[PDB]
Design a protein around this ligand. Structure first.
Ligand SMILES: *C/C=C1/C(=C/C2=NC(=C\c3[nH]c(/C=C4/NC(=O)C(C=C)=C4C)c(C)c3CCC(=O)O)/C(CCC(=O)O)=C2C)NC(=O)[C@H]1C
Ligand SMILES: *C/C=C1/C(=C/C2=NC(=C\c3[nH]c(/C=C4/NC(=O)C(C=C)=C4C)c(C)c3CCC(=O)O)/C(CCC(=O)O)=C2C)NC(=O)[C@H]1C
Ligand SMILES: [Cl-]
Ligand SMILES: [Cl-]
Lengths: 488, 484
């Protein structure tokens, strides 16, 4: 009946009963024969009496309904459609056996293909994920004219990290900030996956009711670009000073990688033709990112194999493998991202970088021995496995253990610091936010504080690539040990 | 003069002629002056006299030269339905070797073709349907795909044809049937057009300029065809062709080859659609090929992990391998596998005889540095291997020890033994002056001779799977000693 902080995790944001006022909406039966529903502003916007029950040809003219019926062969995006009286940008789709027609007054626009080609040409030569992600916020802001453009990337736990930002010089920075998974509820994530673009013209605009809200059953606006916005998010945006937004969904391995989020501090909406271009840019961006990400993964795997092969050849001419490992173990830190590495062999410890103290190591080795079946064991939350590890979480909150034997509890141990310790936040800790009725929950400062609490005593998770490199290292050492036993 | 003795280095990029389905003007780098023109420019464009030493503005007019200069500030630019006298020409424009080349032909599809391949979810399904679709859409008598082999031979892997034509499906041609300069131009250009294999070539005037420079037609679509290739097509009864280059990992994977038994050239708009289809085909093939490779590697890892878990509760690893070795044949394509341990042989499928294994095991022990050793030409390494080439022409050897010459051996048959050729051995061909050489029958016979006593090469993927198997066995052996 009324959304608040206790139920916003389940708000039915796909059936709000309202649209935003920058266009009007007509809902027809699946044949587009009769008008079933309309937004209240259809009269004003299109120049029409009482719309429900009239035929589509009566309301819109036979010529337009004919062209629209043809188009029904993603919603169809049809700029500069000639109405019976003027030009309208029309979005047309069928869902839940309902035809939804969305109208915006047409302006003067370039062909979307040409706008998109200009943008795509300025990222297509990026040859690292870093270079693509940093340039894209600057390019999008320059092309679309928003006050702020950010990219955020979803973390393994569903949190967002802001990884790129272009902004007006007077704004606060969010670069290197995180927000908790709960800042974007599951239904919003489902709709970001389904729709390339999400448009908010005015976070404080009066909603326009869909007549009727409930029929003789609510209207499913999942694919309607005019669909109204959650009061919770509108309040969040108002607290930030944001009045408008457009997000471009980033799809990698068929899932929602993150968003290109465009924010404006005054009501703002892009023409349909520029939105078509943005959608084409989004598709290209996603594919180029996926290709760069794959090449980065391949290069990091090949780097590890090259290093471990050098180690195999080195060890072949060494009578004392323990001594070689005591002299060499620091070099293994270069296989994967870590803040420390150590060697635990025959109840003797050797450490490099950020590691637990020497006295803490026996408890860690005993735990891994009990917990693993002679393969790699890794956690990003040590205190959860070993309460005692809380004391040294600042230095080492995460551990990946590579067994050196199936008959002795000897390990190569990799460590990561508590994630808050490696923050590179460009933001202003003295920047404060106004609130509304829901209070300070709906502010970036509180979002960030909630995130910090969700990852307290935790490190950056060990990725599938980190685990693949650990397995390669485990195997290379089995091989060093076996050939050593063969030849001695 | 080209013949079979020098066609391997024919300078086909500077032939001094064009095909008759358009005309060509060569200007300086700034498109100021006409330097060369095809002899048919007068007839096609309604121009009189020697065009050389006339300004581009004179010959083309102020509007066209302005438009072409603008197109130049941007692959060759394709400008369909340009206004000349108010006539319409499809214009191709490019710059190469400080020369502007302008090509003229008297004057939707891509989305429809791409939509019919985009849902293919195997390389087999994509390449099977593509010949059918291209034939139906572009209206050629035959459409084939061939894929280049590691030695540069072509294998015909897909075919759509008129029911009255002979089949080339499963046929190979040797690397020499496509010379190195032809391969370079197939890599550089998405499309290669032959409007008429019996068309009279049109000279470029002059062929060699006052400075002694030929005109480099590397990027010109009207570039004329080697007399060697025209004779080959005339022997087949082919009169016209268009190829779409297939690019995988930035290299020439093969061609989509469209053949017509009468003259044929597609309009520039349809060619632009075919090029867009070719780019999509290449990217979709690359994606499907990667997926197949990943699935094959993961399949091998899953099997080897099952072998590792199985081995952990076995006291006698030699016995488990004697009982299990035949399953290792499922890791990579092979016709046979066997286990050579403590000088005892266990074989499955097509292998050399019992008597032959010591010599092979001896050779690998001497040849390898304790890692995987593989050849597809056993007789080259070991002359007496010729005797059993029919059964086993290729061998991949996985060491089971660095102190004992114990091996897991994989074998492949002589490649001619695994042939699946759909052609007619009684179909014969007319020949011209160069003779028998320029016929599909002779090309196939030459290929067979180049691969005699050889198997299918062990791929980079086969070798990665062999390395995984070598390592899994090291792990079995080590954990066994750890607990025994
Ligand atoms: C219980 C429900 C809540 C909720 C719902 C919604 N959030 C939606 C969008 C959204 N929210 C944010 C969060 C931010 N946290 C920050 O710290 C921060 C900036 C510093 C932001 C912007 C983000 C990032 C987004 C994504 C859109 C964008 O990036 O612009 C949302 C959907 C809105 C829509 O219909 O378009 C809903 C619903 N937000 C909460 O905080 C809670 C409590
Ligand atoms: C010494 C030079 C030779 C030579 C030159 C050229 N070949 C070119 C193209 C070409 N040749 C073939 C060969 C085939 N072998 C078959 O068995 C067979 C059919 C069953 C064919 C068609 C192929 C496949 C091609 C590629 C084009 C296509 O697939 O249609 C060539 C380039 C021509 C150009 O400029 O377009 C040159 C030059 N061919 C020889 O046989 C030798 C001796
Ligand atoms: Cl507005
Ligand atoms: Cl990434």
């Amino acid at each position: 009946y009324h959304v608040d902080l206790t139920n916003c995790d389940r708000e039915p944001i796909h059936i709000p009963g309202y649209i935003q006022p920058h266009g009007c909406l007509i809902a027809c039966d699946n044949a587009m024969r009769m008008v079933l529903r309309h937004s209240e502003n259809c009269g004003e916007l299109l120049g029409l009496g009482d719309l429900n029950g009239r035929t589509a040809e009566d309301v819109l003219g036979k010529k337009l309904v004919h062209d629209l019926r043809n188009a029904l062969t993603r919603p169809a995006m049809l700029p500069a459609m000639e109405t019976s009286d003027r030009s309208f940008d029309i979005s047309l789709h069928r869902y839940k056996s309902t035809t939804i027609i969305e109208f915006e007054p047409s302006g003067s626009d370039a062909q979307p293909l040409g706008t998109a080609r200009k943008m795509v040409d300025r990222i297509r030569e990026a040859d690292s994920v870093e270079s693509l992600i940093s340039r894209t916020t600057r390019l999008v802001k320059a092309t679309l004219g928003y006050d702020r453009v950010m990219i955020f990337r979803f973390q393994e736990d569903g949190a967002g990290k802001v990884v790129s930002e272009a902004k007006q010089p007077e704004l606060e920075s969010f670069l290197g900030q995180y927000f908790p998974a709960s800042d974007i509820p599951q239904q919003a994530r489902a709709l970001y996956l389904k729709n390339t673009l999400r448009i908010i013209s005015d976070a404080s605009g009066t909603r326009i009711p869909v007549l009727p809200a409930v029929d003789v059953e609510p209207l499913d606006l999942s694919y309607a670009h005019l669909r109204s916005v959650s009061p919770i998010h509108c309040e969040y945006l108002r607290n930030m000073g944001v009045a408008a937004s457009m997000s471009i969904s980033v799809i990698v391995d068929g899932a929602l990688w993150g968003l290109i989020a465009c924010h404006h501090y005054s009501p703002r909406v892009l023409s349909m033709p520029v939105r078509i271009a943005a959608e084409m840019f989004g598709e290209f961006f996603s594919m180029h990112l996926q290709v760069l990400k794959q090449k980065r993964r391949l290069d990091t795997i090949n780097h590890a194999h090259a290093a471990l092969d050098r180690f195999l050849r080195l060890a072949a001419h060494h009578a004392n493998i323990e001594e070689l490992l005591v002299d060499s173990f620091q070099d293994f830190a270069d296989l994967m991202p870590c803040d420390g590495v150590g060697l635990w062999v025959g109840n003797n410890w050797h450490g490099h970088g950020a590691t637990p103290p020497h006295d803490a190591i026996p408890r860690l080795a005993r735990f891994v021995a009990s917990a693993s079946e002679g393969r790699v064991w890794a956690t990003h939350a040590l205190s959860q496995a070993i309460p005692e590890a809380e004391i040294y979480a600042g230095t080492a909150a995460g551990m990946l253990a590579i067994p050196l034997s199936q008959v002795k509890s000897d390990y190569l141990l990799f460590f990561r610091k508590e994630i808050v310790q490696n923050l590179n936040w460009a933001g202003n800790p003295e920047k404060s936010y106004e609130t509304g009725p829901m209070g300070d929950r709906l502010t970036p400062r509180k979002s960030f504080a909630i995130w910090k609490e969700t990852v307290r005593l935790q490190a950056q998770p060990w990725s599938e690539a980190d685990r693949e490199i650990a397995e390669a290292a485990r195997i290379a050492l089995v091989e060093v040990a076996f050939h050593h036993s063969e030849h001695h």
